[PDB]
Design an enzyme around this catalytic site. Structure first.
Site, PDB file in Angstrom:
ATOM      1  N   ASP A  25      37.726  38.035  38.939  1.00 43.86           N
ATOM      2  CA  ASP A  25      36.908  38.594  39.999  1.00 43.86           C
ATOM      3  C   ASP A  25      37.555  39.783  40.696  1.00 43.86           C
ATOM      4  O   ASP A  25      38.368  39.634  41.629  1.00 43.86           O
ATOM      5  CB  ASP A  25      36.599  37.508  41.005  1.00 43.86           C
ATOM      6  N   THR A  26      37.127  40.990  40.319  1.00 43.03           N
ATOM      7  CA  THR A  26      37.661  42.198  40.935  1.00 43.03           C
ATOM      8  C   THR A  26      37.225  42.320  42.379  1.00 43.03           C
ATOM      9  O   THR A  26      37.826  43.128  43.110  1.00 43.03           O
ATOM     10  CB  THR A  26      37.214  43.416  40.180  1.00 43.03           C
ATOM     11  N   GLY A  27      36.190  41.616  42.808  1.00 35.01           N
ATOM     12  CA  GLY A  27      35.734  41.664  44.175  1.00 35.01           C
ATOM     13  C   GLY A  27      36.416  40.656  45.094  1.00 35.01           C
ATOM     14  O   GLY A  27      36.016  40.579  46.269  1.00 35.01           O
TER      15      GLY A  27
HETATM   16  C1  LIG Z   1      28.983  27.824  40.273  1.00 30.53           C
HETATM   17  C2  LIG Z   1      27.801  28.657  40.715  1.00 30.53           C
HETATM   18  C3  LIG Z   1      27.444  28.377  42.211  1.00 30.53           C
HETATM   19  C4  LIG Z   1      27.876  30.105  40.576  1.00 30.53           C
HETATM   20  N1  LIG Z   1      26.967  30.977  40.892  1.00 30.53           N
HETATM   21  C5  LIG Z   1      27.378  32.231  40.577  1.00 30.53           C
HETATM   22  C6  LIG Z   1      26.454  33.414  40.847  1.00 30.53           C
HETATM   23  N2  LIG Z   1      26.464  33.780  42.267  1.00 30.53           N
HETATM   24  C7  LIG Z   1      25.781  32.932  43.252  1.00 30.53           C
HETATM   25  C8  LIG Z   1      27.164  34.889  42.663  1.00 30.53           C
HETATM   26  O1  LIG Z   1      27.673  35.619  41.800  1.00 30.53           O
HETATM   27  N3  LIG Z   1      27.247  35.199  43.973  1.00 30.53           N
HETATM   28  C9  LIG Z   1      28.037  36.428  44.350  1.00 30.53           C
HETATM   29  C10 LIG Z   1      29.310  35.971  45.031  1.00 30.53           C
HETATM   30  O2  LIG Z   1      29.450  35.730  46.225  1.00 30.53           O
HETATM   31  N4  LIG Z   1      30.261  35.824  44.119  1.00 30.53           N
HETATM   32  C11 LIG Z   1      31.571  35.304  44.381  1.00 30.53           C
HETATM   33  C12 LIG Z   1      31.938  34.021  43.585  1.00 30.53           C
HETATM   34  C13 LIG Z   1      31.068  32.837  43.941  1.00 30.53           C
HETATM   35  C14 LIG Z   1      29.879  32.629  43.249  1.00 30.53           C
HETATM   36  C15 LIG Z   1      29.127  31.539  43.602  1.00 30.53           C
HETATM   37  C16 LIG Z   1      29.534  30.591  44.551  1.00 30.53           C
HETATM   38  C17 LIG Z   1      30.709  30.836  45.264  1.00 30.53           C
HETATM   39  C18 LIG Z   1      31.450  31.943  44.946  1.00 30.53           C
HETATM   40  C19 LIG Z   1      32.700  36.298  44.091  1.00 30.53           C
HETATM   41  C20 LIG Z   1      32.527  37.684  44.727  1.00 30.53           C
HETATM   42  O3  LIG Z   1      33.383  38.571  44.038  1.00 30.53           O
HETATM   43  C21 LIG Z   1      32.735  37.733  46.260  1.00 30.53           C
HETATM   44  C22 LIG Z   1      32.328  39.130  46.733  1.00 30.53           C
HETATM   45  C23 LIG Z   1      32.481  39.388  48.237  1.00 30.53           C
HETATM   46  C24 LIG Z   1      33.390  40.316  48.655  1.00 30.53           C
HETATM   47  C25 LIG Z   1      33.631  40.462  49.988  1.00 30.53           C
HETATM   48  C26 LIG Z   1      32.784  39.927  50.935  1.00 30.53           C
HETATM   49  C27 LIG Z   1      31.747  39.103  50.524  1.00 30.53           C
HETATM   50  C28 LIG Z   1      31.614  38.821  49.153  1.00 30.53           C
HETATM   51  N5  LIG Z   1      34.120  37.467  46.604  1.00 30.53           N
HETATM   52  C29 LIG Z   1      34.436  36.423  47.357  1.00 30.53           C
HETATM   53  O4  LIG Z   1      33.802  35.423  47.541  1.00 30.53           O
HETATM   54  O5  LIG Z   1      35.600  36.562  48.047  1.00 30.53           O
HETATM   55  C30 LIG Z   1      35.590  37.901  48.525  1.00 30.53           C
HETATM   56  C31 LIG Z   1      36.531  38.207  49.671  1.00 30.53           C
HETATM   57  C32 LIG Z   1      36.316  38.787  50.884  1.00 30.53           C
HETATM   58  N6  LIG Z   1      37.003  39.941  51.329  1.00 30.53           N
HETATM   59  C33 LIG Z   1      37.764  40.288  50.383  1.00 30.53           C
HETATM   60  S1  LIG Z   1      37.741  39.252  49.012  1.00 30.53           S
HETATM   61  C34 LIG Z   1      27.405  37.647  44.797  1.00 30.53           C
HETATM   62  C35 LIG Z   1      25.872  37.662  44.578  1.00 30.53           C
HETATM   63  C36 LIG Z   1      27.811  38.323  46.054  1.00 30.53           C
HETATM   64  C37 LIG Z   1      28.618  32.316  39.985  1.00 30.53           C
HETATM   65  S2  LIG Z   1      29.270  30.765  39.887  1.00 30.53           S
END
Ligand SMILES: CC(C)c1nc(CN(C)C(=O)N[C@H](C(=O)N[C@@H](Cc2ccccc2)C[C@H](O)[C@H](Cc2ccccc2)NC(=O)OCc2cncs2)C(C)C)cs1
Ligand SMILES: [Cl-]
Lengths: 99, 99
Positions: A25-27
């Site tokens: 996760d680059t984000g």
């Molecule tokens: C297991 C199941 C629930 C999953 N669903 C998914 C699909 N989903 C919902 C997502 O990709 N959702 C995304 C997300 O938040 N992804 C996340 C992983 C994730 C996915 C699902 C459940 C919990 C965590 C991963 C993303 O890189 C986010 C991006 C971010 C960055 C800064 C501020 C806010 C957000 N990163 C973080 O959560 O930590 C970021 C931190 C904040 N400041 C610096 S780093 C985006 C739409 C924003 C993957 S796994």
């Protein structure tokens, strides 16, 4: 290796003597791992995602293997639905985004 | 380009004709941009991550430039803490992870 982004970039990791799947996760600034009983001392932390904050345990100097590449650094443990390898460890394995 | 991960991988985007900064985010399925006025139709949606869910406006088929590269696809607009370019558009610009 090269990982395309048509699907979630999940790889196998080794942490705490356990194999797990985790998202590259680059984000993510930091690495967040699902609840696991890691040994030793830790510090309370709160970290924010889309959505708000959650409580985690910060463990330092944790040995972790990411897709076969050894790494060592801070791991945050708490109630995440997905293990996330963030930039603190992606840099150690020499990962880049390319386009 | 090749982008390393010592720093957050922030780039400039152009959306609705406006310049913004956004994070190239391999851990995001979707693209989420801060509240803004954007031309095009939308429908309500929810999206989640760490911390839970937020309500967003889902805009399909939106033209966006990411670090100078064109994409046309879905953009979710809402109270995200940071502008995120997710895999739906990273694939369009041919981004891969490499290590
Ligand atoms: C297991 C199941 C629930 C999953 N669903 C998914 C699909 N989903 C919902 C997502 O990709 N959702 C995304 C997300 O938040 N992804 C996340 C992983 C994730 C996915 C699902 C459940 C919990 C965590 C991963 C993303 O890189 C986010 C991006 C971010 C960055 C800064 C501020 C806010 C957000 N990163 C973080 O959560 O930590 C970021 C931190 C904040 N400041 C610096 S780093 C985006 C739409 C924003 C993957 S796994
Ligand atoms: Cl997937």
């Amino acid at each position: 290796p090269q990982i395309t982004l048509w699907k979630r970039p999940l790889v196998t990791i080794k942490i705490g003597g356990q194999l797990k799947e985790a998202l590259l996760d680059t984000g993510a600034d930091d690495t967040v791992i699902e609840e696991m009983s890691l040994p030793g001392r830790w510090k309370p932390k709160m970290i924010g995602g889309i959505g708000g904050f959650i409580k985690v345990r910060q463990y330092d100097q944790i040995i972790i293997e990411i897709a076969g590449h050894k790494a060592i650094g801070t791991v945050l443990v708490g109630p995440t639905p997905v293990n996330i390898i963030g930039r603190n460890l992606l840099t150690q394995i020499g990962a880049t985004l390319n386009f």
